[PDB]
């Protein structure tokens, strides 16, 4: 009934961010249509500013006053949050373990971040981030559980429902479930007859196990997967939305993820990152054949291109 | 302009908890009137179920599965009683290195104990693990809005029991009690002053209000007032910042002398943390409070000693 956002938050996020992000195109592939027996549509967030959808949630958090923003998610969220900060005239501090390789340190510096070091543990990441937040009088922006962020990711669905007016399902890769939850909130509020499907690595299948057992079941161990963007577990804010509003979750093997990513590179000529191959792998997977033949028009979110 | 609770939440908490708490009496002391030059009224939460006001917030949180906390003193004791009223287990997270006497005391008030290591880190994560495994909820001792709303009900009773009250004086630790009370008084009768009382040895609240920003204690405070070692937090600070009129600090010696004064001259078995409000009104700087602030109600917040 009442989740950490409603669709009103998504609409507000849309107005909030639309002048500063790309309304990314929806593309097709007859080769992938033939392989799946479906009518596929590819929402190209790999074309989004900062190279992934995450600028949606990050910009909405910064515009929704703080003197600085902080995160220890140093990948696509960190990159997105730093750009959002730049747009708003404030520094972004990224908390990074001191033991991170130079190449990662340099890449984080290169996207505009001010780096603060921690020790390589979840414990240290959070407390150093808290200290930086409290010293800079800024705010921490979580990559997937922050309601302002979830609301921002949900705007993807607003665009898809307009761009593919006869869409039957969306397929969404799931890590922390920020994108999945924002989309589920939006689709089910506007057109609940459209299916919302998550796509998840078998090697990181906390979301799949959670919906099966009916309770939040985070990955016990740090996941090993080439889909680097979906290693996070779902959390306290995204799980209830995913529990009630997401229709199914499809897991894919490491090999499925690799083959799908290569298929997209080679036959679609789109430079997606492997995390973005996860949704494509799902629609190609054996179990997706159990999806009713009436679910013909399927939009897959190609969520990033930072590779 | 909009905090983590409103007056409406306080009133709902009062209705929610009234059948299971005591409307504690307000007492007086001509000796302490004489020493202060004020007309004092003592709200006796030392007489409250579980021995402190904390049952107000604890019960409201449980009525608003299992409950979990790593605050093992008056809050854990209150939370365990609330849990038992509601037919659910209460899990108190305690460091392994805690003294046997303290482990036995926590067991004796009805808790199921789970061990952690003696760090804030370990306390929180073990508490979190117990919470997920029992499908329960963690109830924070001072930052949980349902708890804050519960403590606020003290002010409802005081305003009713002392119609001509000019000020309330409240010990502050995490500021749950202070913030709840400030929300209530300033909603109902903002002409009444809300004063906090704090140990000089744990003066984060005082320093915060001075600097205009949340300034937690840098180190674990050393003070005989065990119940107010916690710093104020993200939910209670904004209320305290905007709705509390003044914070008075007191020395360790002032706290000790006030506590013995209450024992010897009032014959009330307060715990030393409850002596802090009394020390505040006796302190030198309280003499700067306008003479028109005559009727002062001090909360004697606990008797678990
Ligand atoms: C973050 C990320 C995801 C997963 O998003 P969540 O909201 O964490 O589920 C998917 N694809 C890419 C490219 C990402 O960076
Ligand atoms: C907890 C406690 C306090 C302080 O209450 P807070 O809400 O943490 O400020 C004061 N007196 C006693 C006896 C207490 O147990
Ligand atoms: Mg997962
Ligand atoms: Mg203090």
């Amino acid at each position: 009934a009442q989740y950490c956002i409603s669709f009103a938050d998504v609409e507000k996020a849309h107005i909030n961010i639309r002048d500063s992000i790309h309304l990314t195109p929806v593309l097709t592939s007859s080769i992938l249509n033939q392989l799946t027996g479906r009518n596929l549509f590819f929402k190209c967030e790999l074309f989004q500013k900062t190279g992934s959808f995450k600028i949606r949630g990050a910009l909405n958090a910064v515009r929704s006053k703080p003197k600085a923003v902080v995160t220890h998610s140093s990948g696509n969220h960190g990159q997105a949050l730093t750009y959002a900060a730049k747009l708003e005239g404030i520094p972004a501090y990224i908390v990074v373990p001191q033991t991170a390789p130079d190449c990662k340190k340099l890449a984080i510096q290169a996207y505009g971040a001010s780096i603060v070091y921690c020790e390589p543990s979840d414990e240290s990441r959070e407390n150093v981030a808290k200290r930086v937040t409290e010293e800079t009088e800024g705010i921490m922006v979580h990559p997937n559980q922050e309601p302002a962020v979830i609301a921002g990711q949900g705007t993807i669905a607003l665009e898809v429902l307009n761009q593919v007016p006869l869409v039957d399902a969306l397929v969404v890769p799931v890590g922390g479930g920020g994108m999945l939850a924002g989309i589920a909130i939006t689709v089910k509020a506007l057109k609940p007859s459209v299916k919302v499907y998550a796509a998840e690595p078998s090697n990181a299948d906390d979301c799949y196990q959670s919906k099966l057992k009916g309770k939040l079941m985070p990955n016990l161990y740090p996941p090993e997967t080439i889909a680097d963007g979906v290693k996070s577990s779902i959390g306290l804010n995204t799980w209830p939305i995913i529990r009630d509003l997401v229709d199914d979750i499809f897991t894919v093997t490491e090999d499925e993820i690799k083959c799908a990513t290569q298929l997209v590179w080679e036959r679609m000529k789109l430079l997606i990152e492997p995390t973005a191959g996860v949704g494509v792998a799902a629609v190609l997977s054996q179990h997706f054949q159990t999806v009713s033949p009436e679910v013909k028009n399927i939009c897959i979110v190609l969520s990033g291109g930072n590779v």
Side-chain angles (χ1 to χ4, degrees), chain A:
Chain A
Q2 314 251 269
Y3 306 97
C4 66
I5 58 151
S6 65
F7 170 68
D9 296 315
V10 182
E11 175 62 28
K12 185 155 121 117
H14 175 65
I15 304 304
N16 222 291
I17 66 178
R18 58 183 177 174
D19 77 333
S20 304
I21 65 166
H22 293 142
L23 211 173
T24 56
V26 173
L27 276 43
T28 61
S29 167
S30 58
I31 291 161
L32 273 70
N33 282 0
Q34 192 228 18
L35 287 167
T36 60
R38 312 274 175 178
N39 200 23
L40 307 183
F41 298 84
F42 295 85
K43 174 61 164 174
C44 289
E45 285 296 297
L46 82 163
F47 297 155
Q48 188 54 264
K49 295 187 148 65
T50 82
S52 86
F53 67 91
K54 281 198 175 70
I55 185 57
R56 296 172 180 269
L59 190 55
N60 191 49
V62 182
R63 296 191 165 169
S64 293
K65 270 285 151 249
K67 315 189 170 310
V69 300
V70 186
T71 183
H72 50 74
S73 192
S74 62
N76 282 350
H77 183 69
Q79 179 164 350
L81 183 68
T82 295
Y83 178 77
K86 177 195 173 55
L87 281 181
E88 291 296 303
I90 60 181
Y93 299 105
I94 310 296
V95 174
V96 180
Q98 187 259 342
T99 57
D102 299 327
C103 58
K104 221 221 288 185
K105 284 184 185 172
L106 207 62
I108 293 159
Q109 181 185 53
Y111 64 54
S114 180
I115 292 161
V116 182
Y117 289 158
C118 60
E119 277 158 289
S121 77
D122 292 329
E123 295 84 355
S124 186
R125 268 184 204 86
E126 261 287 350
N127 180 32
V128 169
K130 271 338 185 328
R131 178 180 56 68
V132 174
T133 303
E134 269 153 24
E135 287 182 358
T136 63
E137 306 186 16
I139 49 180
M140 265 186 83
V141 181
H142 194 280
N144 44 77
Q145 296 308 298
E146 164 58 52
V149 167
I150 302 168
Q153 322 302 32
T155 62
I156 294 162
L158 283 184
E159 292 172 20
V160 167
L161 288 160
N162 290 337
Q163 287 174 295
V164 196
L166 296 176
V167 68
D168 293 311
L170 281 69
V171 172
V172 182
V174 48
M179 180 169 46
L180 176 61
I183 284 166
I185 284 287
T186 298
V187 173
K188 293 312 186 181
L190 290 182
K191 203 170 187 180
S193 66
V194 172
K195 298 301 183 297
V196 179
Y197 296 134
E200 187 176 38
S202 300
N203 285 16
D205 72 341
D206 59 296
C207 194
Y208 185 86
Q209 299 295 331
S210 286
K211 210 154 174 51
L212 270 196
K213 142 156 294 177
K215 71 186 278 190
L216 175 50
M217 300 295 301
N219 300 310
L220 302 193
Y221 320 119
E224 292 177 350
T225 178
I226 54 161
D228 196 32
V230 287
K231 285 177 176 174
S232 309
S233 297
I234 54 185
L236 295 184
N237 273 343
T238 58
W239 161 241
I241 296 172
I242 295 162
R243 177 200 61 211
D244 300 337
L245 301 188
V246 168
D247 295 289
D248 213 337
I249 303 165
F250 300 90
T251 61
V252 291
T253 70
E254 286 303 288
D255 191 69
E256 281 180 294
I257 293 177
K258 299 179 185 169
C259 293
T261 302
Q262 291 179 301
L263 192 68
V264 171
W265 290 347
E266 295 180 6
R267 321 277 322 159
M268 295 185 71
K269 316 306 179 171
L270 300 178
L271 277 172
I272 54 159
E273 58 183 278
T275 297
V278 170
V280 183
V283 179
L284 295 161
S285 67
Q286 294 299 127
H287 187 55
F288 201 85
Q289 293 178 16
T290 67
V291 175
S292 166
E294 289 182 301
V295 186
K296 299 176 176 186
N297 303 325
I298 304 179
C299 181
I300 306 168
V301 182
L302 301 176
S303 48
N306 284 331
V307 51

